[PDB]
């Protein structure tokens, strides 16, 4: 199916306590593969998936060089943004940046993105055409004017359409057993009495990959969206994901209820019933 590569960067200032903390992480789809943490001992980009450990020293040296340069640009940025917004030197602030690319089923370029936030709010974001920027205020319009200039525009375009796509495909190939897999959810249902007149039915999806899934309850074929407790999809920690959906059912009505599961690993969506 479709795939993406994304890098996520977080920089947090801590005034009086020296240098801003900087964290970088890289994902292919829902699988983390690299990290850097400025507070760690190594000062290196480090592998976080077995399939990227195969990359040689030139890869690790070059990624380490670049991620430290990223780190430095963010350190500068925190100061610039404090200047832009007339903020005091004493408060802690956060910048976040995400960039990357999507490919479709044919592994051809679909979309490129580059987005930036200050203190949890949209600051500037690259539009889908890859030339124009959405600036969220006046300060961001100042940045927009810097990032709009001829040479800088082409360079980001050459990364997002070219390099990001090439490297995504290389990773997909090199990490095939992990990245090109589809793990169908293992599903079951539990029933617990909450009183003598009501019970909870909970529909479980476990051990699935990728994270995208739909779990829904119906009563007599009617969606119970407003009465379903649906938890956020959550990592099991072994590279797979979990989700559940629960309904409270009056006693005797269990057979009216159906749980419906859609996932790319399932050739047909599943319908499950307590019976």
């Amino acid at each position: 199916g479709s795939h993406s590569m994304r890098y996520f960067f977080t920089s947090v200032s801590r005034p009086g306590r020296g240098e801003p903390r900087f964290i970088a992480v890289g994902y292919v789809d829902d699988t983390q593969f690299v990290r850097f943490d400025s507070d760690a001992a190594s000062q290196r980009m480090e592998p976080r998936a077995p399939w990227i450990e195969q990359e040689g020293p030139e890869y690790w040296d070059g990624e380490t060089r670049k991620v430290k340069a990223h780190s430095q640009t963010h350190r500068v940025d925190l100061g610039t943004l404090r200047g832009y917004y007339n903020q005091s030197e004493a408060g802690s602030h956060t910048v976040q940046r995400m960039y990357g690319c999507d490919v479709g089923s044919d592994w051809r370029f679909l979309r490129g993105y580059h987005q930036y936030a200050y203190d949890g709010k949209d600051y500037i974001a690259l539009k889908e055409d890859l030339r124009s920027w959405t600036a969220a205020d006046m300060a961001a319009q100042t940045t927009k004017h810097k990032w709009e200039a001829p040479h800088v525009a082409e360079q980001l375009r050459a990364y997002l359409e070219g390099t990001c796509v090439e490297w995504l495909r290389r990773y997909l190939e090199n990490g095939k057993e992990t990245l090109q897999r589809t793990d169908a959810p293992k599903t079951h249902m539990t029933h617990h009495a909450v009183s003598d007149h009501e019970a909870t039915l909970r529909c479980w999806a476990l051990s699935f990959y990728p994270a995208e899934i739909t779990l829904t309850w119906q009563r007599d074929g009617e969606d119970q969206t407003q009465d379903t407790e649906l938890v956020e999809t959550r990592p099991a920690g072994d590279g797979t994901f979990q989700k559940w959906a629960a309904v409270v059912v009056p006693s005797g009505q269990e057979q009216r209820y159906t749980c419906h599961v859609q996932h790319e690993g399932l050739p047909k969506p599943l319908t499950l019933r307590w019976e």
């Binding site: 670049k66 610039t80 810097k146 980001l156 990364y159 390099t163």
Partner: peptide
């Protein structure tokens, strides 16, 4: 692979 050519805000 990271992008190698970042610009300041």
């Amino acid at each position: 692979m990271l992008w190698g050519y970042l610009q300041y805000v």
